[PDB]
Ligand binder design. Structure first.
Ligand SMILES: O=Cc1cc2ccccc2[nH]1
Ligand SMILES: O=Cc1cc2ccccc2[nH]1
Lengths: 302, 302
């Protein structure tokens, strides 16, 4: 029993983190096969930060201008190119620790593990979710550019996120591993507002199912509700609408607990309208929305 | 910015996890140099669970009765011995991935990362703390026996915990890597009460300092307090007493924020007596006590 915000084991990703320096800027890079991936921020300086001319900055760079270090081992760059917001540095040595991997672009509401790195050295690992406004509420310091997010599916690493910048509000924005930003963000030092964030409804319902599985049952009421009636209440409290796709994905949890999805919606409906009255669910006084239905099944039943 | 319950990178520990089977029981093991460490629970069956005679059970075992598998590789056992509650299985092959390591016994209030493993395969990693009653609030399923807790200090893995059992209350108990249980627990299937748990005061204060560093300042009041007056209030709300050793360890955070430790105590004093009024600190509606002063410095300033 028990329930934690667990992250995937990071060993397969640790063996791929390198340090990338071009001129005077240093950040993290991802070394897969004979290619190092890193944000194109590495070819910038302070002066150009308001609106960098990335093409002109890269035209003036040679392969030798890129210093790539795997631990204490210098990798020789034998070619370079830019794809959207990331650079591909071709090196003469293939990473012997390359895991089976895929590049994926995730949807809002899905979760992934973040390996926070500095100077190519992993510092820590944590679990987070892609918010509906395409930001993440991570923990990054200066020098964390190039840190990657990922999921692990039975020895296959699915890379989904590379870290770029921190917004004035304290949230974070990044790209997929093909260089495209999640959300309407650009790698320039200009004020960029994130959209209004909402709560991931299907994740809260999955988290309530995990509570029932681990013995927290006080919030379950005796009522049911329709899908339309539930979505009307969810709209008032800034929750995402619940779709039949979401009801379908909650099926296995419903079968394990015997609680129909619309019955759990009736219980969430009361929680939204009346609050917790100082009580907690799985050790939290707030409703958690960073556990997918898949995350709940994995932790509650391997 | 941002603040997460971060765990250490697990790669150095993943390379040491093996599967240990003796007879019909299977659990996890820790493979360091030419020795595999695992709970002595592996030589038990259902019948003997109420009060296992561990010495008699081990006397009837040969080296060949122990099946140790590192991935798909079978390790040959060439010797065995029992030290307290763990077994040492000497194998003919040294683990080529053995990191620099130490065996440590931690104190209550200190934190460590847990690598949850099943059949010798890491499943996830999370951060937790040794409670004052010597339990941990982890997340384990059946088959998690032998999972280890650890800290990483610049390439040196300090192993501090090996998982054994789950109490009827849903909390977890284990041993150090020399086989001695944390707290008054025995590896038998008998009802064993944990002592009344308390809140780790110095960790809450460190977590409040992390809030100030990341911009949450609403709880800071205009008052100060003495150490004796603070401990009187902390006693009423089941908080550990604050010692001068704790005041000393909070020094660096006080210097960074300019807030004297006794001033932050005055602010915690008001929070304990009046509550949060529905507001949150670092995204939580409860006071968190699983971040040490060392954890806060690492995440807020690498
Ligand atoms: O990857 C690092 C990085 C990208 C970026 C864009 C704007 C401002 C700071 C930034 N850092
Ligand atoms: O390590 C696994 C393990 C030890 C133990 C003791 C009592 C009951 C169950 C147990 N599992």
């Amino acid at each position: 029993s028990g329930f934690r915000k667990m992250a995937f084991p990071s060993g397969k990703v640790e063996g791929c983190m390198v340090q990338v320096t071009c001129g005077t800027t240093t950040l993290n890079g991802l070394w897969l096969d004979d290619v190092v991936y890193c944000p194109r921020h590495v070819i910038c300086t302070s002066e150009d930060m308001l609106n960098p001319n990335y093409e002109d900055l890269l035209i003036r760079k040679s392969n030798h201008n890129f210093l790539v270090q795997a631990g204490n081992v210098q990798l020789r760059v034998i070619g370079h190119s830019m794809q959207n917001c990331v650079l591909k540095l071709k090196v003469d040595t293939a990473n012997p620790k390359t895991p089976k991997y895929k590049f994926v672009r995730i949807q809002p509401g899905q979760t992934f593990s973040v390996l926070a790195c500095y100077n190519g050295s992993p510092s820590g690992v944590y679990q987070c979710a892609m918010r509906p406004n395409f930001t993440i509420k991570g923990s990054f310091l200066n020098g964390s550019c190039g840190s990657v997010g990922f999921n692990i599916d039975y020895d296959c690493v699915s890379f989904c996120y590379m870290h770029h910048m921190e917004l004035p509000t304290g949230v974070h924005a990044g790209t997929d591993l093909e260089g495209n930003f999640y959300g309407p963000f650009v790698d320039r030092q200009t004020a960029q507002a994130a959209g209004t964030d909402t709560t991931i409804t299907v994740n809260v319902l999955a988290w309530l199912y995990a509570a029932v599985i681990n013995g927290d049952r006080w919030f379950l009421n005796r009522f049911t509700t329709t899908l339309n009636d539930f979505n009307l209440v969810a709209m008032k409290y800034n929750y995402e609408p619940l779709t039949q796709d979401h009801v379908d994905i909650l099926g296995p949890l419903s079968a394990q607990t015997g609680i129909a999805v619309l019955d759990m919606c009736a219980s969430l409906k009361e929680l939204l309208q009346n609050g917790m009255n100082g009580r907690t669910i799985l050790g939290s006084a707030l409703l958690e929305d960073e556990f997918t239905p898949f995350d709940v099944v994995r932790q509650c039943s391997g």
